[PDB]
Assembly symmetry: D2
């Protein structure tokens, strides 16, 4: 999968997801920094917070590049806080809108890019889907996003082959982890983008090192290591 998030002055979903020359739309069939999966055609999702702070989501099980309704409507959806993703499904995992990121607990939107053995994760009655990413999202929400770095280190110890890239937002904050896959940050005058990979060739993009947490609030970007072992 590939994901992108925005925190700042309002931008349209189209501006963030569809319009950039190497953005999520292009990454659905031609990603540039993806080591796992040739493309991200197994659905997509876009979540945003409206002016009242309500989390809203549009998700699909079809390839993003083929969605004529989203192409038409996305320019009309503007938000200060967005999380969107294109999916590459793990083999055996249902391809269905409820399995597409972003997941939500009503306060947070969350996307997972990676791979995790479901067998090491706690059972839950609160997942939105049975697929591995949704079970992981359930765990993360249960533990609280303030504990994101510790939760991810814990899971990473339980499954040494797990890839645990998280991107989450609550309308006034972004949180993200690097754990086996890519993430970059772009600081604009009007806000901050976090993304699996840069959506263009802007020299302002900065790559986040592996096994780190990124915490964005009121224009401050703070990058911290995670615990290994």
């Amino acid at each position: 999968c590939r994901h992108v998030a925005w925190l700042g002055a309002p931008r349209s979903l189209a501006d963030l997801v569809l319009d950039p020359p190497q953005g999520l739309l292009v990454q659905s069939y031609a990603p540039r920094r993806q080591k796992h999966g040739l493309m991200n055609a197994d659905g997509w999702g876009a979540g945003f917070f409206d002016d009242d702070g309500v989390a809203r989501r549009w998700r699909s099980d079809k390839p993003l590049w083929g969605d004529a309704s989203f192409a038409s409507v996305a320019p009309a959806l503007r938000s200060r806080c967005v999380v969107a993703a294109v999916r590459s499904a793990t083999i055996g995992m249902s391809i269905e809108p409820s399995a597409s990121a972003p997941f939500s607990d009503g306060q947070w939107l969350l996307s997972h890019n990676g791979l995790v053995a479901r067998g090491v994760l706690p059972l839950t009655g609160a997942a939105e889907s049975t697929v591995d990413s949704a079970i992981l999202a359930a765990l993360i929400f249960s533990r609280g996003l303030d504990a994101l770095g510790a939760t991810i280190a814990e899971v990473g110890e339980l499954d040494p082959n797990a890839r645990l890239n998280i991107l989450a937002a609550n309308g006034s904050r972004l949180l993200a982890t690097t754990w086996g896959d890519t993430l970059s940050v772009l600081r604009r005058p009007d806000g901050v983008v976090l993304a699996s990979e840069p959506y263009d060739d802007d020299p302002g993009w900065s790559d986040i090192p592996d096994r780190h947490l990124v915490d964005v609030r009121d224009a401050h970007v703070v990058v911290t290591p995670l615990s290994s072992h």
Copy 2:
């Protein structure tokens, strides 16, 4: 099919389509004035014009009541001009989003509720779908909406079994025809609704007689016989 249109102060798609107690959402499974079909579950569409006058559309081939994305997002989509529809498909007709109203030529959004023998219509390379309503839409667009009344009157004579209820909008006007099916109008302080059936029990609703043209602009509703 059942359709609804709005022209006036900005209104959310949810407010027009999902929230009323007997609106389009309810009509997808429990319509109140539908003589053809018991339901409208073969897709839906919602078209609107944004603040810059661009026609935008969301269309689906699934039942409107089942769409969690539309239920989540529709409240955040507001427009001065909306055309939406729930579809009941005729046998043999493709059930796919391109076959769901509203159709568009970029300037006008258009919904057809009814039935027409495709054989009486010209061949076209400009239709959005193979389904009869899309072939009819193509014809209506090629003649121009200012000639809507004449086009429908003509097709009505070519196919005396056709039902040709049209609802159309361009951001600043609504046009509709009654030809074998229902249309009602609601004049609000902030705009006008046209609908296959009233979405509530507001005493302001009034029915348009069959075989008429309806023209809405600058808050005026002009109803004239097709002839």
Copy 3:
């Protein structure tokens, strides 16, 4: 939901599901004996066992009446043992193919018609979907289909408001429960049909009484009471 099952001489999926004058196809938009839901348009599924005993499934989240591929292909799919269902989704439940019956553990195909509070069911890592029917199916599979009667009687106590109509098959056996919704049986010379409602006006149809378990093997139809 409405479901149907067949155990007997090979029969096409179309012959069981699409062709009868009041069968599952018609029940997707005009069910005759359904107290909960107006229709069953929120997807469908058909499962069958091939000549090697492999369970195979086709499921959708769209209305059965609109599926041109199934209408075209179903006549070419023949089996001695079939379980199929059309779905009416409970409010708030995902409408997605993994949430449509039949569910499977590889040996059994299973359909649930009803409603059950997920809060009374144990957590599982083995469910195919998050919807209540899938969580219930996981429990049923875990306990084993030979304990179906015990499982349903237990859940019916835990949730007094639950409706627990099960229809399941393993290639050589049908199992079903009535627990708050309808079921009928037709014994033909070449096999047995179990169905939420009769698919035609055959005088052979007989209604199964509520709070019973049906066991077809095969050769023999058992209709035995459940614990209430």
Copy 4:
């Protein structure tokens, strides 16, 4: 697009399309005889003839690799005559099942791999979709398949940039044209495969040169030139 056909002893859809190491399933995300970056994820279809000669079809607008129902059911569908395809949609064409090959006139199944300006094709009321391939199929059916070679040469002269690879079958015959793409043929002891590209590394595969008609009946392959400019 990529397509494949079978004419011979009964063979399952799975055995033809899903099971080979480089067959249609693999070609949906990793074709071997188109440039890298290319894929065929914009739907798929499988048509076959049953014992009574009835043409039957399963079509989708989703990527073939993602379809759990087809993977489950296809091994149980066996036929003496199969035409299947995975679609890559060209600019502004609808992505919808009616637009996926194979098309049918009740007697023939037909797949088109290529590109043609709808502007040079006759208008029709008999097309299954609005897409260029459906309009072309309507023309081909109207002229009759015994005229396939002449029809393709005609269209090819009207549109010098057209790519017009056809693969068709009627239950007892295959017909194909090469026109801008190549076809390959495999003669097994029990039947004949025609394919956009070989589905394995069997040394029996041979390539059909461009601008030819292929006619298969009773495991007898006849290759003829098409008329040139």
